[PDB]
Amino acid sequence: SYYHHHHHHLSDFYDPRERDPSVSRRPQNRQSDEWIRELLLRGTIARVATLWQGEDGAAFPFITPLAYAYRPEQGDLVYHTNVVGRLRANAGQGHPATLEVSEIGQFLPSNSPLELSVQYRSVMVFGTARVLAGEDARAALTTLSERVFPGLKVGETTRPISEDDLKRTSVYSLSIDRWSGKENWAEQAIQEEDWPALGPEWLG
Amino acid sequence: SYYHHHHHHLSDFYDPRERDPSVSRRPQNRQSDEWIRELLLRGTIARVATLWQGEDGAAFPFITPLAYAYRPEQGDLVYHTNVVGRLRANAGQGHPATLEVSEIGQFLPSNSPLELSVQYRSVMVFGTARVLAGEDARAALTTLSERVFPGLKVGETTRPISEDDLKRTSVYSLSIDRWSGKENWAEQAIQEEDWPALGPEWLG
Structure with missing residues (x-):
């Protein structure tokens, strides 16, 4: 900055910058519903948090990483997991x-400590999960499988999903109520001009 | 299998296998406390789930991906995030x-549909998070920064963390109560011998 430069020899916010007009003007790094849909379509791993009743009676969340598939027409995401707690902290079948x-x-x-960051794109989905049965479960597991193993076809590449398979697996449909999308994928963090610039080790 | 082979020409569980005696005998893919510690020490990204009060009064979990650092001696993990909801679903300062x-x-x-899987190692930590202030916050942010940017040194590579920095940042210590560790990192999924084997496209 001038003040600092001048002091050695002896604000930013409102001053000129470049802006691409094609860029999202949404606050807090938020993204469009279309952007959310497309990120969900290309991902294969999610974390799901659901509430279980703990020792003290209080609900608390599990976090499980797992394979998933977004089904845009049905308005849900499907996954399978046999992870459970004791009792869910919830009234209902879902x-x-x-x-x-x-x-x-x-x-x-x-070179500015609070500008250290990590590039990310992130969606949160809020909804209600329910266990699928029979052909609903078989179809959901097939969609899941064929999504996360591109080119695999259940019944050809694999044997068909049997009744025994279904008995041994908890397959869920998480029906979407709302969702949130966030991106901060800058090429470079903001730097502090009035401190020695990062060396070539860092940025090259 | 014999039965299938013989039928073409016209159990597994209790029969011989190899076992490495050095391998974990823990059920459900569980791991040792030492293994958990070491996985936490080498990771840099976590998801944190905490409960917020929703529209219907009911608590529900957020999931936030973020940079973290495990501090074994203090018995906590540190991270920073300005993500919040409306009211936390919780009584207390933590x-x-x-x-x-x-x-x-x-x-x-x-070639067996319910043997499709993904390699993973995964730890869940359960504890209580609290917001840090002043030099506690500065020290935690420094440990975090210098952990996830190896070779970076706050005060040299970067300017020091200022009071203004701290005012603008929510830095947390998640004090560990319990933890869980899980690994399934096989080289190959279990296959079905009585269905055509996967082609070289899949396993090669």
Whole structure:
């Protein structure tokens, strides 16, 4: 900055910058519904959080990483997992679930400590999960399988999904109520001009 | 299998196998406390789930991906995030938090549909998170920064963390109560001998 330069020889916010007009003007790094849909379509791993009753009676969340598939027409995501707790912290045949999908890029170095960051794109989905049965479960497991193993075809590449298979597996449909999308994927973190610039080790 | 082979020309569980005696005999893919510690020490990204009060009064979990650092002596994990909801679903200055760290490897193809899987190592930590202030916050942010940017040194590579920095950042210590460790990192999924084997496209 001038003040600092001048002091050696002896604000930013409102001053000129370049802006691409094609860029999202949404606050807090938020993204469009279309962007959310497309990120969900290309991901294969999510974390799901659901609530279980703990020792003290209080609900608490599990976090499970797992394979998933977004089914846009049905308005849900499907996954399978045999992870459970004792009792769910919930009344009903379905349970509230939060699902997160992200693309995590590189850590971005800076000479300004609070500008250190990591590149990310991240969606949170809020909805209700329910266990599927019979042909609903078979179809969901097939869609899942054929999504995350591109080119695999159940019944050809694999034997068909049997009744025994279904008995041994908990397959869920998380029906979407709402979702959130967030991106900060800058190429470089903001740097502090009035401190020695990062060396070539960091940015090259 | 014999039965199938013989039928073409016209159980597994209790029969001989190889076992390495050095391998974990823990059920359900569980791992030792030492293994958990070391996985936490080498990771840099976690998801944290905490409970927020929703529209219907009911608590529900957020899932936030973020940079973290395990501090073994203090018995906590540190991270920073300005993500919040409206009101936390919790009484106190601290809040219950679940933190998950994983190493996700490759999807493992099979000719048996319910043997399709993904390689993973995964830890869940259960504890109480609290906001840090002043030099506690500065020290935690420094440990975090210098952990996830190896070779970076706050005060040299970067300018020091200022009071303004701290005012603008929510830095947390998640004090560990319990943790869980899980690994299934086989080289190949279990295959079905009585269905055509996967082609070289899949396993080669």
